[PDB]
Amino acid sequence: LASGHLASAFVASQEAVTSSELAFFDPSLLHLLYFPDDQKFAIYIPLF
Amino acid sequence: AAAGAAATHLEVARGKRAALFFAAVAIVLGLPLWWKTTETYRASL
Amino acid sequence: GTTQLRATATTLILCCLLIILPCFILP
Amino acid sequence: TPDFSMPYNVICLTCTVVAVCYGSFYNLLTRTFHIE
Amino acid sequence: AAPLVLVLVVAVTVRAALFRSSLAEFISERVEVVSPLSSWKRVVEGLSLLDLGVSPYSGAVFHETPLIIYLFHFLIDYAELVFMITDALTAIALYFAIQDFNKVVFKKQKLLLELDQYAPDVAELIRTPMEMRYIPLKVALFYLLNPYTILSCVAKSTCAINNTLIAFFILTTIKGSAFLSAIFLALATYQSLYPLTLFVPGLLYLLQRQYIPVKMKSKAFWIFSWEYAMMYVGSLVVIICLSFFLLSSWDFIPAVYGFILSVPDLTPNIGLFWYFFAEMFEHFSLFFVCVFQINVFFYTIPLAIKLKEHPIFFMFIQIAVIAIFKSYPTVGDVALYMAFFPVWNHLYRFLRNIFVLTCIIIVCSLLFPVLWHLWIYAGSANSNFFYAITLTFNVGQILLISDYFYAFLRREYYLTHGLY
Amino acid sequence: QLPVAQIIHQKPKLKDWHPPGGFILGLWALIIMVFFKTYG
Ligand SMILES: *NCCOP(=O)(O)OC[C@H]1O[C@H](O[C@@H]2[C@@H](OC[C@H]3O[C@H](O[C@H]4[C@H](O)[C@@H](N)[C@@H](O[C@@H]5[C@@H](O)[C@H](O)[C@@H](O)[C@@H](OC(=O)CCCCCCCCCCCCCCC)[C@H]5OP(=O)(O)OC[C@@H](COCCCCCCCCCCCCCCCCCC)OC(=O)CCC/C=C\C/C=C\C/C=C\C/C=C\CCCCC)O[C@@H]4CO)[C@@H](OP(=O)(O)OCCN)[C@@H](O)[C@@H]3O)O[C@H](COP(=O)(O)OCCN)[C@@H](O)[C@@H]2O)[C@@H](O)[C@@H](O)[C@@H]1O
Ligand SMILES: CCCCCCCC/C=C\CCCCCCCC(=O)O[C@H](COC(=O)CCCCCCCCCCCCCCC)COP(=O)([O-])OCC[N+](C)(C)C
Ligand SMILES: CCCCCCCC/C=C\CCCCCCCC(=O)O[C@H](COC(=O)CCCCCCCCCCCCCCC)COP(=O)(O)OCCN
Ligand SMILES: CC(C)CCC[C@@H](C)[C@H]1CC[C@H]2[C@@H]3CC=C4C[C@@H](OC(=O)CCC(=O)O)CC[C@]4(C)[C@H]3CC[C@]12C
Ligand SMILES: CC(C)CCC[C@@H](C)[C@H]1CC[C@H]2[C@@H]3CC=C4C[C@@H](OC(=O)CCC(=O)O)CC[C@]4(C)[C@H]3CC[C@]12C
Ligand SMILES: CC(C)CCC[C@@H](C)[C@H]1CC[C@H]2[C@@H]3CC=C4C[C@@H](OC(=O)CCC(=O)O)CC[C@]4(C)[C@H]3CC[C@]12C
Ligand SMILES: CC(C)CCC[C@@H](C)[C@H]1CC[C@H]2[C@@H]3CC=C4C[C@@H](OC(=O)CCC(=O)O)CC[C@]4(C)[C@H]3CC[C@]12C
Ligand SMILES: CC(C)CCC[C@@H](C)[C@H]1CC[C@H]2[C@@H]3CC=C4C[C@@H](OC(=O)CCC(=O)O)CC[C@]4(C)[C@H]3CC[C@]12C
């Protein structure tokens, strides 16, 4: 866009949008529900 | 006579080695394994 | 109304820790 | 079916059973006999 | 010997009578007696699947090694005869192994008596040939007539075969035979992964028998240890590669070893892994399964440190630890280390808490079927009752094994320093 | 909808499974090799 090539700029921007949306909205980001931090002592105290 | 003195030192040394093994394993294999198996994987960005 | 799942810290963790530590290690 | 209300208590109890063996074997392997 | 033949006849007759009884079907389906890796119905299912052109390892019912399927393809008939013969062979191997071990330990005792290495007055602790006369017979009798072993062989579980392999490993190790001990240890590791821990006790006993000091500076120790390790690894590699060719595929390695190491079934057992992983947060599943499978291999090294000069007791403790902390434990596995109790019954005077622990073990065993029936068929009980029974049973086992270990240590200390 | 004749013959004939001859030969060869290495 600084240089002046509008077609290449448009293609690059489209690829940027596609990649950013795929990265942000990946289902793999949400993997497990929250485990309470005030209940981990019940997980680590009894054995360790 | 000297049999008891030769054996008790060996038993104390063996107990020391057993305690060292327990602590050293429970640290060296204990903590890295916990961190690797309970972490949330995060590739570099 | 309802009940969420919460650990019984006083009831069981204390019991199952004082069944190990004073039985074996400290005394 | 399992209990569905016993994940913390089962963890505590099974870990305690394992720690029983751990502590007993640790004492037997580490400590040595002494008089009085 | 005549008493050994009489005991063998009595055991075979009892097993045959229970085979022809109406309780065979009841015993065959007990979760305490059979396991996902050892049930007979699963052997029959995996043999029937091969007739349909379906690989038996493509399903989730069959988890046995190719050697078992090859053995039971030819011997699908006479299965009860096969299992009775395996039990008798285990008894014979244990009998002769203990008989040779008694002579070896008496020679050692005579040596340190001649050298006057013991305390001035330990005559009560001194072992005599009269007290050791019937120890080999009692070893074979505590295994043949154990209710655990009788149930495990009437149910037609391959646990009996794996016990026979371990017993022959013990016999060959006690009678020199580094080659045969390595082959039998490789076969035992083939059926179940855990028996590989017995490598250290076997190596220690072989080194002691061959009179090689186990020292870091020593070179003969390193040479012999390398030969034994190479022999074991080669015998295991050859078995794996050979049994690959039975179905021309590697799918047996997952279905057996990944099953053993990852515990996918979660089916009730006398073990401690069934509920822990049924009632479990998926956040720490990998960490806790790693910890629990480390637990079995955890004690071999520290036990070798303390018990370097007592390898047979080390092997007995290791067998007990395997039977207790296995992923899929069985009363048949438990019965293998209770055959060693007559060997260590000279430690009785130093045994605390023997009556209570024996009573607890008996109570838990008798209470397994009752509470299992209440939970499953009656419906008036939960899985919590069975879980509590497993907890109490394993605690009793652990305390009994540690109690024998403590008695052994007490006897060694008294022999070295002086009994009052 | 129900071609019985084709359904029967689409799957090849079922033969009882037997262990490979090469496998049994190799197993027996290993067993006799160990037997001779033990007995001399
Ligand atoms: N609009 C408005 C609305 O409303 P509101 O307003 O809000 O309101 C309303 C509400 O409400 C509610 O609430 C809630 C609810 O809930 C509901 C629920 O449901 C369910 O749950 C349930 C369940 O089911 C059940 N099951 C139950 O369970 C339970 C649990 O949970 C709890 O937790 C508990 O209880 C448990 O338990 C426990 O925990 C226990 C533990 C603790 C303790 C431990 C112990 C310790 C130790 C011991 C001792 C020591 C040792 C030493 C000694 C010396 C449970 O219970 P169970 O289960 O029942 O059971 C118990 C147990 C079992 O059992 C056992 C027994 C055992 C057996 C035997 C033993 C052995 C013996 C041995 C022998 C002897 C020996 C001899 C020797 C001698 C000789 C001569 C010398 O379990 C267990 O675990 C146990 C444990 C074990 C331990 C141990 C072992 C044993 C033993 C040892 C000892 C001893 C022995 C030795 C020795 C001796 C001698 C020697 C000398 C030296 O739970 C629940 C109920 O509660 C669920 O759901 P489901 O539906 O199911 O599902 C869903 C999802 N899907 C949940 O979730 C829910 O939540 O409601 C309630 C009520 O209900 P019912 O129905 O009414 O009830 C029923 C009952 N059954 C309430 O409460 C709540 O709150 C809400 O939520 C809502 O709904 C609404 O809305
Ligand atoms: C069977 C034999 C087999 C043996 C095999 C052994 C193998 C295993 C051996 C050792 C594995 C060690 C696991 C536990 C280490 C730390 C766990 C922890 O506290 O997490 C805290 C929880 O917060 C709390 O609730 C703490 C309350 C009590 C803490 C218990 C103290 C134990 C510390 C010493 C125990 C022993 C260590 C050294 C001992 C000298 C905070 O952690 P977190 O951030 O919330 O958790 C997120 C996890 N990531 C993301 C950080 C990765
Ligand atoms: C059939 C389905 C369920 C059946 C459940 C039964 C299974 C139980 C099997 C094994 C449990 C045993 C665990 C502990 C074993 C102890 C080993 C042992 O031999 O220790 C011996 C000690 O023995 C004991 O103290 C235990 C005996 C006390 C309680 C047991 C007896 C009462 C129980 C009977 C109940 C059933 C009766 C029915 C008819 C028999 C040592 O003896 P020794 O050294 O030879 O003495 C001479 C000294 N120089
Ligand atoms: C041969 C005889 C001596 C056996 C010994 C008996 C013990 C095994 C009993 C006696 C008192 C009992 C305890 C009495 C009270 C409790 C509290 C109880 O916790 C609750 O109040 C329930 C909490 C919940 O439901 O989450 C858990 C069982 C426990 C520890 C019991 C466990 C079993 C005990 C130790
Ligand atoms: C193979 C090892 C590693 C584990 C299994 C133990 C074997 C050493 C035993 C257990 C069962 C035994 C078999 C039980 C029954 C028979 C049938 C017997 O012949 C018959 O009775 C056949 C009669 C007929 O077919 O008409 C020959 C010995 C044999 C194969 C036995 C050979 C030795 C076996 C395989
Ligand atoms: C016994 C000790 C001394 C190691 C011996 C190594 C090899 C004899 C074996 C052991 C594990 C085997 C591997 C286990 C698993 C697989 C995956 C398999 O691929 C699959 O079909 C996928 C199976 C799956 O992961 O579910 C191909 C063979 C391979 C590499 C095997 C190749 C042969 C290996 C390396
Ligand atoms: C005779 C002995 C010495 C063989 C030793 C080899 C085992 C230690 C290996 C061989 C095959 C492995 C298994 C192959 C496949 C799996 C499935 C895997 O679970 C998954 O499906 C996850 C796959 C992924 O993470 O991408 C967990 C590990 C496990 C059980 C592996 C555990 C380790 C095993 C049993
Ligand atoms: C094979 C011997 C000689 C080494 C000692 C074995 C154990 C001390 C550890 C070492 C690596 C562990 C394995 C590493 C990876 C896995 C995959 C893991 O796969 C899963 O996540 C599915 C099981 C579940 O998550 O519940 C199951 C446990 C397992 C087989 C572990 C079981 C316990 C193992 C075998």
PDB file of N, CA, C and O and ligand atoms in Angstrom, chain E residues 193 196 261-262 285-286 289-290 293-294 297, ligand 8:
ATOM      1  N   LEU E 193       4.202 -56.315  31.370  1.00  0.00           N
ATOM      2  CA  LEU E 193       5.373 -55.450  31.300  1.00  0.00           C
ATOM      3  C   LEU E 193       6.124 -55.403  32.626  1.00  0.00           C
ATOM      4  O   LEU E 193       7.359 -55.381  32.638  1.00  0.00           O
ATOM      5  N   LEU E 196       9.658 -56.981  34.348  1.00  0.00           N
ATOM      6  CA  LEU E 196      11.015 -56.581  33.987  1.00  0.00           C
ATOM      7  C   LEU E 196      11.776 -56.035  35.188  1.00  0.00           C
ATOM      8  O   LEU E 196      13.006 -55.928  35.144  1.00  0.00           O
ATOM      9  N   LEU E 261      -0.289 -49.956  30.149  1.00  0.00           N
ATOM     10  CA  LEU E 261       0.319 -48.720  30.624  1.00  0.00           C
ATOM     11  C   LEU E 261      -0.656 -47.554  30.722  1.00  0.00           C
ATOM     12  O   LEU E 261      -0.424 -46.637  31.517  1.00  0.00           O
ATOM     13  N   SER E 262      -1.736 -47.555  29.947  1.00  0.00           N
ATOM     14  CA  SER E 262      -2.645 -46.417  29.899  1.00  0.00           C
ATOM     15  C   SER E 262      -3.966 -46.664  30.616  1.00  0.00           C
ATOM     16  O   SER E 262      -4.704 -45.703  30.857  1.00  0.00           O
ATOM     17  N   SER E 285      -5.111 -36.276  34.244  1.00  0.00           N
ATOM     18  CA  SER E 285      -5.157 -37.704  33.947  1.00  0.00           C
ATOM     19  C   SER E 285      -3.788 -38.226  33.531  1.00  0.00           C
ATOM     20  O   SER E 285      -3.319 -39.248  34.045  1.00  0.00           O
ATOM     21  N   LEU E 286      -3.128 -37.531  32.602  1.00  0.00           N
ATOM     22  CA  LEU E 286      -1.818 -37.973  32.137  1.00  0.00           C
ATOM     23  C   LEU E 286      -0.794 -37.947  33.264  1.00  0.00           C
ATOM     24  O   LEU E 286      -0.024 -38.900  33.436  1.00  0.00           O
ATOM     25  N   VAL E 289      -1.609 -40.840  35.801  1.00  0.00           N
ATOM     26  CA  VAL E 289      -1.316 -42.172  35.283  1.00  0.00           C
ATOM     27  C   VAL E 289       0.190 -42.374  35.175  1.00  0.00           C
ATOM     28  O   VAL E 289       0.704 -43.462  35.465  1.00  0.00           O
ATOM     29  N   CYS E 290       0.929 -41.324  34.800  1.00  0.00           N
ATOM     30  CA  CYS E 290       2.384 -41.419  34.782  1.00  0.00           C
ATOM     31  C   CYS E 290       2.927 -41.695  36.178  1.00  0.00           C
ATOM     32  O   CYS E 290       3.796 -42.554  36.357  1.00  0.00           O
ATOM     33  N   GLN E 293       2.038 -45.397  37.258  1.00  0.00           N
ATOM     34  CA  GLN E 293       2.874 -46.412  36.631  1.00  0.00           C
ATOM     35  C   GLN E 293       4.347 -46.262  36.984  1.00  0.00           C
ATOM     36  O   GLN E 293       5.094 -47.241  36.884  1.00  0.00           O
ATOM     37  N   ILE E 294       4.786 -45.067  37.385  1.00  0.00           N
ATOM     38  CA  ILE E 294       6.122 -44.927  37.949  1.00  0.00           C
ATOM     39  C   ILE E 294       6.205 -45.639  39.289  1.00  0.00           C
ATOM     40  O   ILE E 294       7.243 -46.216  39.629  1.00  0.00           O
ATOM     41  N   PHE E 297       7.732 -49.202  39.314  1.00  0.00           N
ATOM     42  CA  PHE E 297       9.166 -49.242  39.059  1.00  0.00           C
ATOM     43  C   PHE E 297       9.957 -48.372  40.025  1.00  0.00           C
ATOM     44  O   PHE E 297      11.181 -48.284  39.898  1.00  0.00           O
TER      45      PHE E 297
HETATM   46  C1  LIG G   8       8.370 -49.264  30.119  1.00  0.00           C
HETATM   47  C2  LIG G   8       9.199 -49.124  31.381  1.00  0.00           C
HETATM   48  C3  LIG G   8      10.529 -49.831  31.221  1.00  0.00           C
HETATM   49  C4  LIG G   8       9.409 -47.672  31.762  1.00  0.00           C
HETATM   50  C5  LIG G   8       8.632 -47.179  32.974  1.00  0.00           C
HETATM   51  C6  LIG G   8       7.165 -46.916  32.671  1.00  0.00           C
HETATM   52  C7  LIG G   8       6.498 -45.852  33.557  1.00  0.00           C
HETATM   53  C8  LIG G   8       7.454 -45.424  34.662  1.00  0.00           C
HETATM   54  C9  LIG G   8       5.993 -44.666  32.713  1.00  0.00           C
HETATM   55  C10 LIG G   8       7.084 -44.112  31.782  1.00  0.00           C
HETATM   56  C11 LIG G   8       6.335 -43.409  30.635  1.00  0.00           C
HETATM   57  C12 LIG G   8       4.842 -43.545  30.977  1.00  0.00           C
HETATM   58  C13 LIG G   8       3.803 -43.467  29.858  1.00  0.00           C
HETATM   59  C14 LIG G   8       3.943 -42.162  29.080  1.00  0.00           C
HETATM   60  C15 LIG G   8       2.743 -41.866  28.237  1.00  0.00           C
HETATM   61  C16 LIG G   8       1.556 -42.440  28.371  1.00  0.00           C
HETATM   62  C17 LIG G   8       0.413 -42.063  27.455  1.00  0.00           C
HETATM   63  C18 LIG G   8      -0.878 -41.835  28.216  1.00  0.00           C
HETATM   64  O1  LIG G   8      -1.961 -41.710  27.245  1.00  0.00           O
HETATM   65  C19 LIG G   8      -3.067 -41.055  27.634  1.00  0.00           C
HETATM   66  O2  LIG G   8      -3.106 -39.870  27.831  1.00  0.00           O
HETATM   67  C20 LIG G   8      -4.235 -41.985  27.780  1.00  0.00           C
HETATM   68  C21 LIG G   8      -4.421 -42.501  29.196  1.00  0.00           C
HETATM   69  C22 LIG G   8      -5.090 -41.524  30.118  1.00  0.00           C
HETATM   70  O3  LIG G   8      -4.856 -40.276  29.815  1.00  0.00           O
HETATM   71  O4  LIG G   8      -5.779 -41.865  31.056  1.00  0.00           O
HETATM   72  C23 LIG G   8      -1.190 -43.007  29.113  1.00  0.00           C
HETATM   73  C24 LIG G   8      -0.052 -43.223  30.104  1.00  0.00           C
HETATM   74  C25 LIG G   8       1.273 -43.530  29.399  1.00  0.00           C
HETATM   75  C26 LIG G   8       1.157 -44.871  28.653  1.00  0.00           C
HETATM   76  C27 LIG G   8       2.400 -43.562  30.469  1.00  0.00           C
HETATM   77  C28 LIG G   8       2.264 -44.747  31.431  1.00  0.00           C
HETATM   78  C29 LIG G   8       3.393 -44.846  32.455  1.00  0.00           C
HETATM   79  C30 LIG G   8       4.769 -44.848  31.788  1.00  0.00           C
HETATM   80  C31 LIG G   8       4.913 -46.059  30.855  1.00  0.00           C
END
